[PDB]
A paper describes a structure:
For this purpose, we constructed the S148I point mutant of the mRubyFT (here and after—mRubyFTS148I), which stabilizes the timer in its blue state over time. The crystal structure of mRubyFTS148I was elucidated using an X-ray crystallography method at 1.8 Å resolution. There is one protein molecule per asymmetric unit, and contact analysis revealed that the protein is a monomer in the crystal. The chromophore positioned on the central helix of the barrel is formed by 68LYG70 amino acids. The chromophore is covalently bound to the neighboring F67 and S71 residues. Its imidazolidinone moiety is restricted on one side by the carboxyl oxygen of T65 and is additionally fixed by hydrogen bonds with R72, R97 and E220. The chromophore has a clear electron density except for its phenolic moiety, where density is poor. In this conformation, the phenyl oxygen of the chromophore is directly hydrogen bound to the side chain of T163 as well as to E150 and T181 via a solvent water molecule. At the same time, the poor electron density of the phenyl moiety suggests that it could be flexible as the oxidation of the methine bridge did not occur. Moreover, compared to the parental protein mRuby (corresponding residue H148), in mRubyFTS148I, isoleucine is shifted 1.3 Å closer (distance between Cα-atoms of corresponding residues) to the chromophore. This shift in the orientation of the I148 side chain hampers the rotation of the phenolic moiety of the chromophore to a cis conformation and restricts it from being coplanar with the imidazolidinone moiety. The absorption/excitation/emission band maxima at 407/410/460 nm are within a 3 nm difference from the blue form of the mRubyFT timer, indicating that the S148I substitution practically did not affect the photophysical properties of the blue chromophore but blocked the transition into the red form.
The mRubyFT is a monomeric genetically encoded fluorescent timer based on the mRuby2 fluorescent protein, which is characterized by the complete maturation of the blue form with the subsequent conversion to the red one. It has higher brightness in mammalian cells and higher photostability compared with other fluorescent timers. Blue-to-red fluorescent timers (FTs) change their fluorescence color from blue to red during maturation. Monomeric blue-to-red fluorescent timers Fast-FT, mRubyFT and mTagFT have been developed from the mCherry, mRuby2 and TagRFP red fluorescent proteins, respectively, and the corresponding mechanism of timer maturation with the formation of a red chromophore through its blue form has been proposed.
Residue numbers in the entry: 4 to 67, 71 to 227
């Protein structure tokens, strides 16, 4: 397909994120690379405005890349077929003890480089919770269930954010992935799972600089 010519064995990506959590404005930029067909990617993130953030970088880490999924033979790749136009995603994340995050993301391809704009709106995190107290130590591995939905995908995840001393902050994502393609055809997948391993490396003392690595692999349900 026309999508999986434009998506080379090695792709670069850059991201602008802007938003607020409990009324705190911030901007982050990031740039990285990976292998879309191995499901592997890494990106270097800076907080350029509102830093240091008075909340866990962990609530932003899942908003920084669905072109980099290893789709086994037998499961159509919605994301790679979307190009050259790309796709959007919108997500509601409801955290166990109050917090609600709204995300609208645009994915474009410009000059063979993937471009992400991310709009983030976090509210109602408890002032003394581990998110607003910066007492989180990253995510457990994720399985996202992908469901076909009127020519897009619906993504459903139950996730675990790790907190200081052990125990977890449970949260659920529902994500709507829509293609921006207006000229052309698509092969839709059926229901399938995507396993995601999202890790932090190389964080600065106050998470002003963060490297994320992700490994995303599709499988049968």
């Amino acid at each position: 397909s026309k999508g999986e010519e434009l998506i080379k064995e090695n792709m670069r990506m850059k991201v602008v994120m802007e938003g607020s959590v409990n009324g705190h404005q911030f901007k982050c930029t990031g740039e990285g690379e990976g292998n879309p067909y191995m499901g592997t990617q890494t990106m270097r993130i800076k907080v350029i405005e509102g830093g240091p953030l008075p909340f866990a970088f962990d609530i932003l880490a899942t908003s920084f890349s669905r072109t980099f999924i290893k789709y086994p033979k037998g499961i159509p790749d919605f994301f790679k077929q979307s190009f050259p136009e790309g796709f959007t995603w919108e997500r509601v994340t409801r955290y166990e003890d109050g917090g609600v995050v709204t995300v609208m993301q645009d994915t474009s391809l410009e000059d063979g480089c993937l471009v992400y704009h991310v709009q983030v709106r976090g509210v109602d995190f408890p002032s003394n919770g581990p998110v607003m107290q910066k007492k989180t130590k990253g995510w457990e591995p994720i399985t996202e269930m992908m469901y076909p939905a009127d020519g897009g995908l619906r993504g459903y995840t139950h996730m675990a954010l790790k907190v200081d001393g052990g125990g977890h902050l449970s949260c659920s994502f529902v994500t709507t992935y829509r293609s921006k393609k207006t000229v052309g055809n698509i092969k839709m997948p059926g229901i399938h799972a995507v396993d995601h391993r999202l890790e932090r490396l190389e964080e600065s003392d106050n998470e002003m600089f963060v490297v994320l690595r992700e490994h995303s692999v599709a499988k049968f349900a």
